[PDB]
Amino acid sequence: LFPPQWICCDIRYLDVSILGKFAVVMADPPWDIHMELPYGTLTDDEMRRLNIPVLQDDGFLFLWVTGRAMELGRECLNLWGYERVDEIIWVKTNQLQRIIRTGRTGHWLNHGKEHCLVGVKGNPQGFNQGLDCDVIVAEVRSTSHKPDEIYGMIERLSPGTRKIELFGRPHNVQPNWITLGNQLDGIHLLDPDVVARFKQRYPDG
Amino acid sequence: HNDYCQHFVDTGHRPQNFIRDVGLADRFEEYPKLRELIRLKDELIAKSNTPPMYLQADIEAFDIRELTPKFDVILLEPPLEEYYRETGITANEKCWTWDDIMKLEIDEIAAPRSFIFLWCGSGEGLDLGRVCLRKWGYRRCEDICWIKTNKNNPGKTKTLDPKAVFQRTKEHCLMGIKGTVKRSTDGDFIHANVDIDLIITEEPEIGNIEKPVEIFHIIEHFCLGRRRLHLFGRDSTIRPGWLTVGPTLTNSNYNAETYASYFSAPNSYLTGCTEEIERLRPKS
Ligand SMILES: Nc1ncnc2c1ncn2[C@@H]1O[C@H](CSCC[C@H](N)C(=O)O)[C@@H](O)[C@H]1O
User: Fold this and answer.
1) Which domain holds residue A167?
2) Count of structural domains within chain A
3) In this complex, do A133 and B5 lie within 8 Å of one another by their Cβ atoms?
4) Which of B125, B220, B14 has the alpha carbon at shortest distance from A85?
5) Could you tell me the residue range of the domain that residue B74 belongs to?
6) Number of Cβ atoms within 10 Å of the Cβ of B63
């Protein structure tokens, strides 16, 4: 176990086999939801081809989904070797613990929540079931931060294991986690085994 | 750290216990124009509602085509085994597997432009209900979550599904769309964005399988179609504006000719709308 580690990279092209195996994978990908967005997205085929399978032999996946990715995310979860076994929802509140009910915040109904699929792979050991509820209640914070409560839920589920987050930003770096994303501050690696494999694979850089 | 997840670990109060103003009345107590939109739409629904109609039927053996005319909205509440495994109580009716549910010929009674609301539970039904929607010819388009609080009985409850990782404290009602509907052009069929995709109530009494009545309010506010079917309803869910069909109904009054007459000339299958509602409802 180590302090926060991160790699500024394009996740489509990083050879993630150098990172070893993780008890938990978490990802918040910019899905192609078939609408104009003020940020760039990954195509369905780019998502399908992410080398998620090498990151894990036994453990859990947390995959945020929205729009048509409710279904595309399920496809990816099964393709990567997981069975969906839970679905967390994050209920978004305002500053006074109320849901914002007005506006036009979904296509048919308004939206008060975000969804995170939970998948399992293999036969994980040393995990604690049933410690947390599958509902998170938290305000929206800063620039689209998913709720930090999720890290505590995952730590109670799988204490002291190594974990990897995909599409993370500097605010997402955490002890026991390796964070991958293209807005991180360079490359900061501390695990000697990961450092050694990184030098072999990228002798230049 | 105002971490309600940690607070649940420490106290047994579910995070949803701390969401304020979730009741039908208190949500817009301070917002007269928001309250007025709901009040006028509910009056429009009540003024145009058919009297309750209901039919006892063993849906597993029933030719569903005997239900006419076609329906603008269908609410489907099949009795899932998980409702009883997770509570421990013995069911007093046949439980339906997802294979059983899939076999229903819902596409044979849905109107060409219409919506479905399918209670899917909290486990494998979130996946298999989506397959049912495909089979019946709908596209999944929203997910209404019923989130259960435990304000009156704080504590943990063991989820019995051996695959579960977290304590399951909600149920999902998947919404599907059939046909082509454009919310800017088809305002005589839908009023979009009047409700949110969350219902928050206290966990029901020990042996209570009912779903929250607010699901009817969301459906009625959203779709102006007057032909509304509730499959697997019960005596306790009978409601003006709805045809209720289910195995545990104790009596039947459904007459297909009389029911259809409420929607044919000089009547309409749509509620219409008032100028006051048109000026208040959310629009592009
Ligand atoms: N191909 C790619 N490779 C690496 N990062 C990418 C990427 N495409 C998008 N990203 C990054 O992924 C991040 C999505 S914002 C992610 C939100 C994060 N879970 C939170 O809690 O805030 C952005 O920084 C974006 O620039």
Assistant:
1) 1-205
2) 1
3) yes
4) B125
5) 1-284
6) 9
